[PDB]
Design an enzyme around this catalytic site. Structure first.
Site, PDB file in Angstrom:
ATOM      1  N   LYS A  94       0.842  -1.189   0.000  1.00 25.19           N
ATOM      2  CA  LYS A  94       0.000   0.000   0.000  1.00 25.19           C
ATOM      3  C   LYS A  94       0.882   1.246   0.000  1.00 25.19           C
ATOM      4  CE  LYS A  94      -3.916   2.074   2.462  1.00 25.19           C
ATOM      5  NZ  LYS A  94      -3.336   3.444   2.414  1.00 25.19           N
TER       6      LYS A  94
ATOM      7  N   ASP B  35       1.592  -9.580  13.957  1.00 25.16           N
ATOM      8  CA  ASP B  35       0.496  -9.900  13.050  1.00 25.16           C
ATOM      9  C   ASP B  35       0.909 -11.159  12.296  1.00 25.16           C
ATOM     10  OD1 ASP B  35      -1.283 -10.104  10.875  1.00 25.16           O
ATOM     11  OD2 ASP B  35      -1.623  -7.933  10.896  1.00 25.16           O
TER      12      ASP B  35
ATOM     13  N   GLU C 182      15.554 -10.597   3.917  1.00 24.30           N
ATOM     14  CA  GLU C 182      15.856 -11.981   3.588  1.00 24.30           C
ATOM     15  C   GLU C 182      14.777 -12.420   2.601  1.00 24.30           C
ATOM     16  OE1 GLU C 182      15.395 -14.427   6.992  1.00 24.30           O
ATOM     17  OE2 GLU C 182      15.587 -16.343   5.936  1.00 24.30           O
TER      18      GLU C 182
ATOM     19  N   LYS D 141      12.476  -4.233  -0.488  1.00 24.46           N
ATOM     20  CA  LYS D 141      11.179  -3.584  -0.353  1.00 24.46           C
ATOM     21  C   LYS D 141      11.355  -2.075  -0.501  1.00 24.46           C
ATOM     22  CE  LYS D 141       6.969  -3.424   2.410  1.00 24.46           C
ATOM     23  NZ  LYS D 141       6.221  -3.924   3.603  1.00 24.46           N
TER      24      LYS D 141
ATOM     25  N   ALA E 198      12.483 -15.373   1.063  1.00 22.72           N
ATOM     26  CA  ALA E 198      11.935 -16.686   1.436  1.00 22.72           C
ATOM     27  C   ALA E 198      11.539 -17.342   0.122  1.00 22.72           C
ATOM     28  CB  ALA E 198      10.710 -16.518   2.344  1.00 22.72           C
TER      29      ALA E 198
ATOM     30  N   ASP F  23       5.808  -9.766   9.440  1.00 19.15           N
ATOM     31  CA  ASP F  23       4.730  -8.790   9.599  1.00 19.15           C
ATOM     32  C   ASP F  23       5.334  -7.396   9.727  1.00 19.15           C
ATOM     33  OD1 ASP F  23       5.821  -9.670  12.135  1.00 19.15           O
ATOM     34  OD2 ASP F  23       4.255  -8.470  13.101  1.00 19.15           O
TER      35      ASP F  23
ATOM     36  N   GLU G 103      -0.685 -14.525   5.411  1.00 19.71           N
ATOM     37  CA  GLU G 103      -0.020 -13.690   4.417  1.00 19.71           C
ATOM     38  C   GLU G 103       1.289 -13.084   4.922  1.00 19.71           C
ATOM     39  OE1 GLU G 103      -3.948 -13.213   3.866  1.00 19.71           O
ATOM     40  OE2 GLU G 103      -3.419 -13.854   5.894  1.00 19.71           O
TER      41      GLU G 103
END
Ligand SMILES: O=C1CNCC2=C1[C@@H](c1ccccc1F)c1c[nH]nc1N2
Length: 251
Positions: free
Chosen positions: A20, A133, A88, A39, A90, A151, A137
């Site tokens: 978002k 959280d 990292e 990210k 995954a 999270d 997801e």
């Protein structure tokens, strides 16, 4: 003394996801050819949401957290318009994806995931870090299929939805919701409306399908206690006979 990173230090690969506030890309560190996730967060957007103070806090925490079942944040850097997080990667994707693909997990896979989550949560609590959280997801899988918390509604405990005060016990409730969703395919309090879900959680109203065994029911029912003090301790989860009989991995 720390390491300074720059965009030119990585070979940007394919997009892994959409956020978002930005996107995540697979990448390779030019020097070590090491595969990682990059990210990208847009400041203009982080600002127009008042979550900047949240990001700063989470980044601080994550940098200090070092556990095999917690996604590692190697570092970060930024420019005039973006904040970059070096994470990292995954390789096996999200647990959410595996759940949708399989529809539900067997007892061995579920107990193993719960063990890894309980270990990670126990580590977090020892560092005074709570309320993770852990929805499907936000759970990733390493190269060996090991769970990684990443999270950084259907899962909120009674105390929170009711606007009351809470503590680390909220993570035990989360673990019960996850154990149920792993075994069943859907969270326990799912309903048509937000209002209905809310009443479902508040009253701790849920049912067990026939295939959910006695041991799993005992664990889930104890984790999903309305009163936080009646929920077991993480060590009691790791020692639960259903966990020790089914987990393919030790604590
Ligand atoms: O966003 C996605 C989308 N699903 C694959 C995936 C990521 C990403 C990630 C997941 C959760 C939180 C932050 C984060 F950067 C990611 C990081 N490492 N491997 C990943 N795989």
């Amino acid at each position: 003394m720390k390491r300074q990173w720059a965009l030119e230090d990585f070979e940007i690969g394919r997009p892994l996801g959409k956020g978002k506030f930005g996107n995540v890309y697979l990448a390779r560190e030019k020097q070590s050819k090491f595969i990682l996730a990059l990210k990208v967060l847009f400041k203009a957007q982080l600002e127009k949401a008042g979550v900047e103070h949240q990001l700063r806090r989470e980044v601080e925490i994550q940098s200090h957290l070092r556990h095999p079942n917690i996604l590692r944040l190697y570092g970060y850097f930024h420019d005039a318009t973006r904040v970059y997080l070096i994470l990292e990667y995954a390789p096996l994707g999200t647990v959410y994806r595996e759940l949708q693909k399989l529809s539900k997990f067997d007892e061995q896979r579920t107990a193993t995931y719960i063990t890894e989550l309980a270990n990670a949560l126990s580590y977090c609590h020892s560092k005074r870090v709570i309320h993770r959280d852990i929805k499907p997801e936000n759970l990733l899988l390493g190269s060996a299929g090991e769970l990684k918390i990443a999270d950084f509604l259907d899962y909120l405990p009674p105390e929170m939805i009711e606007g009351r005060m809470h503590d680390e016990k909220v993570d035990l409730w989360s673990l019960g919701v996850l154990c149920y969703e792993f075994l069943v395919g859907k969270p326990p309090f799912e309903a048509n409306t937000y209002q209905e879900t809310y009443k479902r959680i508040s009253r701790v109203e849920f049912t067990f399908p026939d295939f959910v065994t006695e041991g799993a029911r005992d664990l889930i029912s104890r984790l999903l206690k309305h009163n936080p003090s009646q929920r077991p301790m993480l060590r009691e989860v790791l020692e639960h006979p259903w966990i020790t009989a089914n987990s393919s991995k030790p604590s």
